[PDB]
Design a protein around this ligand. Structure first.
Ligand SMILES: Cc1cc2nc3c(=O)[nH]c(=O)nc-3n(CC(O)[C@H](O)[C@H](O)COP(=O)(O)OP(=O)(O)OC[C@H]3O[C@@H](n4cnc5c(N)ncnc54)[C@H](O)[C@@H]3O)c2cc1C
Length: 368
């Protein structure tokens, strides 16, 4: 295959690790440079789920579907109202288990990580600078020895600072905002809400305030509250100390049932983040010194309320990965050129749904 050279993937998230695996399956030489300190760093967030057709195809090809099923956990979902009434409830039906079981972000990385040869990932590696060499890239790492690569694959999230050689387009705030926390022993610390989820993911929407929870992410309750960014914050409240956040949440939620409030009372620390999108507007630099591309969130960061992200990114993995091994191209530049073409197709389409959908809710109504 077209790589008797060496690849550098920047980013050990689910998309970056899948790349690594798909390449290394074909005897390609890959290293993943991850900035997490070690294998064991906690990944904050909800649970991923892999769709048939996309995410799961990624896993089928990596020879990892069964392992994914093993560790994943199917979940019904309830729609509830501001009051605690279950409006709807779709349960796991035996036949449709495998459609999209939820997996914990750390568990998934354990699966991927386990599938790579030793020392494929190089930990404690924060990429800060890239530089086109004679015939290969030079990667700069904060207070760590530099490295070289014939191909660089950016897979380092939606805030990647090293996007320039591919495009001058930059991420943008979408208009909405997300607060989220985890509650441990949710069954005694927030029994009302925990009992309300009754073993299913829970969602409720009220006057443009979204509450979404999963009662069982490896035994913790994860939840997030989303909303249109308050007119004032121009980019002012502080997620450092919680009394600030609690007053704010408890305000826009005073309307809501005591059970949800108890959710905002027990949570010890909150993390705030503005929804962003890396818009697939114009084409990317046709003029590139050395081979380089982007997959997953680096390529098309988009709002999550649709259910998008990662599947779309794992598809990137799949598609690029094949292009560079099916020998159906006479050069690397061609193969990446082609992948970037296909992904612009379904990328724009996804980003279209999620954006529009984001506008749907966060209005004065919704019904999922
Ligand atoms: C609030 C919220 C809820 C979401 N819910 C869902 C959901 O329910 N389902 C779903 O499918 N998606 C969801 N998403 C989307 C989602 O999870 C992303 O698409 C997914 O994380 C993308 O994977 P990735 O590998 O491309 O990027 P990342 O997961 O962000 O991986 C990037 C990796 O690169 C590393 N990194 C960053 N900078 C550097 C650097 N300079 N050098 C080296 N490494 C670096 C990071 O440590 C990280 O490990 C949600 C997103 C948000 C914000």
């Amino acid at each position: 295959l077209l790589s008797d050279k060496n690849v550098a993937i920047i980013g050990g998230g689910p998309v970056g690790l899948t790349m690594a695996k798909l390449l290394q399956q074909n005897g390609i030489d890959v290293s993943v440079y991850e900035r997490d300190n070690d294998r064991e760093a906690r990944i904050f967030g909800g649970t991923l789920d892999l769709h048939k057709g996309s995410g799961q195809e990624a896993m089928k090809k990596a020879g990892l579907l069964q392992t994914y099923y093993d560790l994943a956990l199917p979940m019904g979902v309830n729609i509830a109202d501001k009051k605690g009434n279950i409006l709807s409830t779709k349960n796991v039906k035996p036949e449709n288990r495998f459609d999209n079981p939820e997996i914990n972000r750390n568990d998934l990385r354990a699966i991927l990580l386990n599938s790579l040869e030793n020392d494929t990932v190089i930990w404690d590696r924060k990429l800060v600078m890239l530089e086109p060499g004679k015939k290969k890239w030079t990667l700069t790492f904060e207070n760590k020895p530099s490295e070289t690569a014939d191909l660089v694959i950016l897979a380092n999230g939606g805030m990647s600072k090293v996007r320039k050689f591919v495009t001058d387009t930059e991420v943008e705030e979408t208009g909405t905002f997300n607060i989220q926390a985890d509650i441990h022993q949710p069954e005694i610390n927030c029994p009302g809400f925990f009992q309300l989820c009754n073993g299913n993911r829970l969602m409720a929407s009220h006057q443009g305030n979204l509450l979404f929870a999963n009662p069982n992410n490896n035994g913790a309750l994860h939840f997030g509250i989303s909303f249109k960014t308050p007119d004032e914050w121009k980019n002012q409240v502080d997620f450092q100390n919680r009394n600030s956040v609690v007053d704010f949440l408890l305000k826009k939620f005073s309307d809501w049932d005591e059970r949800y409030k108890e959710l905002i009372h027990t949570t010890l620390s909150f993390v705030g983040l503005a929804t962003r999108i890396f818009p697939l507007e114009k084409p990317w630099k046709s003029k590139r010194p050395l081979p380089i591309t982007m997959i997953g969130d680096a390529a098309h960061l988009m709002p999550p309320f649709a259910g998008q992200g990662v599947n779309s990114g794992l598809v990137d993995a799949l598609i690029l990965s094949d292009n560079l091994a099916d020998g159906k191209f006479n050069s690397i530049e061609e193969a990446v050129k082609n992948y970037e073409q296909q992904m612009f197709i379904y990328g724009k389409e996804a980003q279209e749904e999620s954006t529009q959908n984001e506008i749907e809710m966060f209005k004065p109504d919704f019904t999922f």
